[PDB]
Design an enzyme around this catalytic site. Sequence first.
Site, PDB file in Angstrom:
ATOM      1  N   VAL A  59       0.891  -1.294   0.086  1.00  0.00           N
ATOM      2  CA  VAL A  59       0.115   0.024  -0.123  1.00  0.00           C
ATOM      3  C   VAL A  59       0.969   1.419  -0.131  1.00  0.00           C
ATOM      4  O   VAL A  59       1.694   1.474   0.980  1.00  0.00           O
ATOM      5  CB  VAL A  59      -1.185   0.021   1.199  1.00  0.00           C
ATOM      6  CG1 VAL A  59      -1.665   1.356   1.064  1.00  0.00           C
ATOM      7  CG2 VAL A  59      -2.204  -0.913   1.024  1.00  0.00           C
ATOM      8  N   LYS A  66      -6.525   7.108  -2.500  1.00  0.00           N
ATOM      9  CA  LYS A  66      -7.857   6.590  -2.995  1.00  0.00           C
ATOM     10  C   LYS A  66      -8.640   5.939  -1.712  1.00  0.00           C
ATOM     11  O   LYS A  66     -10.086   6.309  -1.800  1.00  0.00           O
ATOM     12  CB  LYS A  66      -7.548   5.392  -3.976  1.00  0.00           C
ATOM     13  CG  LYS A  66      -7.305   6.098  -5.453  1.00  0.00           C
ATOM     14  CD  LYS A  66      -6.900   4.877  -6.294  1.00  0.00           C
ATOM     15  CE  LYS A  66      -6.902   5.511  -7.946  1.00  0.00           C
ATOM     16  NZ  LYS A  66      -5.545   6.013  -7.963  1.00  0.00           N
ATOM     17  N   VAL A  97     -15.135 -14.451 -20.572  1.00  0.00           N
ATOM     18  CA  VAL A  97     -15.505 -15.392 -21.313  1.00  0.00           C
ATOM     19  C   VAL A  97     -14.188 -16.065 -21.566  1.00  0.00           C
ATOM     20  O   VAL A  97     -13.180 -15.651 -21.899  1.00  0.00           O
ATOM     21  CB  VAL A  97     -15.852 -15.013 -22.658  1.00  0.00           C
ATOM     22  CG1 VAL A  97     -15.998 -16.402 -23.682  1.00  0.00           C
ATOM     23  CG2 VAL A  97     -17.071 -14.224 -22.808  1.00  0.00           C
ATOM     24  N   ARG A 143     -19.410 -22.768  -8.739  1.00  0.00           N
ATOM     25  CA  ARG A 143     -18.453 -23.477  -8.135  1.00  0.00           C
ATOM     26  C   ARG A 143     -18.935 -24.963  -8.005  1.00  0.00           C
ATOM     27  O   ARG A 143     -19.895 -25.335  -8.555  1.00  0.00           O
ATOM     28  CB  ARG A 143     -18.348 -22.796  -6.709  1.00  0.00           C
ATOM     29  CG  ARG A 143     -17.593 -21.690  -6.759  1.00  0.00           C
ATOM     30  CD  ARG A 143     -17.169 -20.996  -5.411  1.00  0.00           C
ATOM     31  NE  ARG A 143     -15.967 -22.325  -4.935  1.00  0.00           N
ATOM     32  CZ  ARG A 143     -14.697 -22.037  -5.329  1.00  0.00           C
ATOM     33  NH1 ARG A 143     -14.354 -21.056  -6.228  1.00  0.00           N
ATOM     34  NH2 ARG A 143     -13.872 -22.759  -5.048  1.00  0.00           N
ATOM     35  N   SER A 174      -7.464 -27.035  -4.938  1.00  0.00           N
ATOM     36  CA  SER A 174      -8.072 -27.022  -3.546  1.00  0.00           C
ATOM     37  C   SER A 174      -8.947 -28.184  -3.158  1.00  0.00           C
ATOM     38  O   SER A 174      -9.022 -28.360  -1.863  1.00  0.00           O
ATOM     39  CB  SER A 174      -8.987 -25.718  -3.698  1.00  0.00           C
ATOM     40  OG  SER A 174     -10.061 -25.943  -4.489  1.00  0.00           O
ATOM     41  N   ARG A 177      -6.689 -29.898  -0.986  1.00  0.00           N
ATOM     42  CA  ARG A 177      -6.300 -29.087   0.158  1.00  0.00           C
ATOM     43  C   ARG A 177      -7.627 -29.311   1.082  1.00  0.00           C
ATOM     44  O   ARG A 177      -7.791 -28.623   2.080  1.00  0.00           O
ATOM     45  CB  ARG A 177      -6.108 -27.572   0.019  1.00  0.00           C
ATOM     46  CG  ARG A 177      -4.747 -27.343  -0.875  1.00  0.00           C
ATOM     47  CD  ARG A 177      -4.234 -25.682  -0.710  1.00  0.00           C
ATOM     48  NE  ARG A 177      -5.258 -24.857  -1.073  1.00  0.00           N
ATOM     49  CZ  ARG A 177      -5.596 -24.325  -2.273  1.00  0.00           C
ATOM     50  NH1 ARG A 177      -5.034 -24.961  -3.452  1.00  0.00           N
ATOM     51  NH2 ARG A 177      -6.649 -23.523  -2.410  1.00  0.00           N
ATOM     52  N   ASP A 184     -12.611 -25.843 -10.423  1.00  0.00           N
ATOM     53  CA  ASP A 184     -12.091 -26.602 -11.510  1.00  0.00           C
ATOM     54  C   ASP A 184     -11.462 -28.002 -11.160  1.00  0.00           C
ATOM     55  O   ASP A 184     -11.286 -28.052  -9.939  1.00  0.00           O
ATOM     56  CB  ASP A 184     -11.254 -25.876 -12.696  1.00  0.00           C
ATOM     57  CG  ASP A 184      -9.955 -25.565 -12.058  1.00  0.00           C
ATOM     58  OD1 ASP A 184      -9.763 -25.813 -11.018  1.00  0.00           O
ATOM     59  OD2 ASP A 184      -9.111 -25.074 -12.740  1.00  0.00           O
ATOM     60  N   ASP A 240      -8.496 -30.115 -16.085  1.00  0.00           N
ATOM     61  CA  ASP A 240      -7.048 -30.323 -16.731  1.00  0.00           C
ATOM     62  C   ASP A 240      -6.459 -31.273 -16.453  1.00  0.00           C
ATOM     63  O   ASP A 240      -6.735 -32.005 -15.609  1.00  0.00           O
ATOM     64  CB  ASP A 240      -6.061 -28.930 -16.314  1.00  0.00           C
ATOM     65  CG  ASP A 240      -6.433 -27.685 -16.703  1.00  0.00           C
ATOM     66  OD1 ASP A 240      -7.483 -27.452 -17.834  1.00  0.00           O
ATOM     67  OD2 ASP A 240      -6.054 -26.679 -16.155  1.00  0.00           O
TER      68      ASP A 240
HETATM   69 MG   LIG Z   1      -6.026 -25.236  -9.864  1.00  0.00          MG
HETATM   70 NA    NA Z   2     -11.156 -14.585 -20.678  1.00  0.00          NA
HETATM   71 NA    NA Z   3       3.323   0.835   2.699  1.00  0.00          NA
END
Ligand SMILES: [Mg+2]
Ligand code: NA
Ligand code: NA
Length: 318
Positions: A59, A66, A97, A143, A174, A177, A184, A240
Amino acid sequence: PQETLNGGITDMLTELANFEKNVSQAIHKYNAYRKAASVIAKYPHKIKSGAEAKKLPGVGTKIAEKIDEFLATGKLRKLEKIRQDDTSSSINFLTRVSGIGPSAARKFVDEGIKTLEDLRKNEDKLNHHQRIGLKYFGDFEKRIPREEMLQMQDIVLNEVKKVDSEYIATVCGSFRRGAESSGDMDVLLTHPSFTSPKLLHQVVEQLQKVHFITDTLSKGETKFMGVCQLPSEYPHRRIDIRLIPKDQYYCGVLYFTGSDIFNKNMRAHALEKGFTINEYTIRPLGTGVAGEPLPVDSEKDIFDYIQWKYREPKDRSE
DNA sequence: CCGACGTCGCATCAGC
DNA sequence: GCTGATGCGAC
DNA sequence: GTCGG
Ligand SMILES: [Mg+2]
Ligand code: NA
Ligand code: NA
Ligand SMILES: [Mg+2]
């Protein structure tokens, strides 16, 4: 920490990161905002001023500014303006997409293709990946509850063992995990006869044969990217499949297990003990000379070399 | 002041 | 034809 | 945009 401590701030930063990446094509500001959003999400106090935020690493002077504006007014003038801008919010949207990145989305919007409907009307200006990205736009953002992941895993291990009983397959991501849901499925493959082609294709082929795999995004000698569907309808899902040589397999499993922040943290510690770790190998550092890959026969070997205690996949969020 | 900022497989493009 | 560059999805 | 040589 509850989203509502700094959720407005981290959402502002996330949305800014997206415009940088998708519209401006400034990948480095996109990572700069994400890094600042992550470090603020983890911060366990409601931020009261830009200066307080400014102490967190990542930061800096302009995000501090901001933040003050957002504290003072409930918004950012710049982000309000970019949101309402037809061109910019279309470019940014089309990138949702799969297969359309900042450069295709620009090129589409330039010729007046701004929406999914416009995309549907012009399929011939889409490459193969892009059509599949479109045909599954909604499915791809959903999901995957763990229960379907286990049923998808049942199908993958069974069919992999059936092609050749000497394959070794591990679902990473995940899922591995122990997450209650997943975005996916990532499958890592190896075979005793592969160290440092048909081995990949034969598996892809068996999963098409029992109708698990329905579409193909890309397929090479080592990586397959595609779509699968549990038999009934369930949403279509990203899968995959990668074939890795045996002596790089456990590195592959660690890396594709992640997460992100965990791997980074582990690369960083790995660094402080004079080692480097990529998706393939772990190598000792020499003056800074990465030398030869070390033997690895489990995930553990790796954690050992770096003198870190093995971590259960469970405990690898970071 | 100004360069680094993660790294890599595959599809498809630009150019010879 | 070919090679090398670029876009894209990815811990 | 942020950090740091
Ligand atoms: Mg992955
Ligand atoms: Na894309
Ligand atoms: Na900083
Ligand atoms: Mg056998």
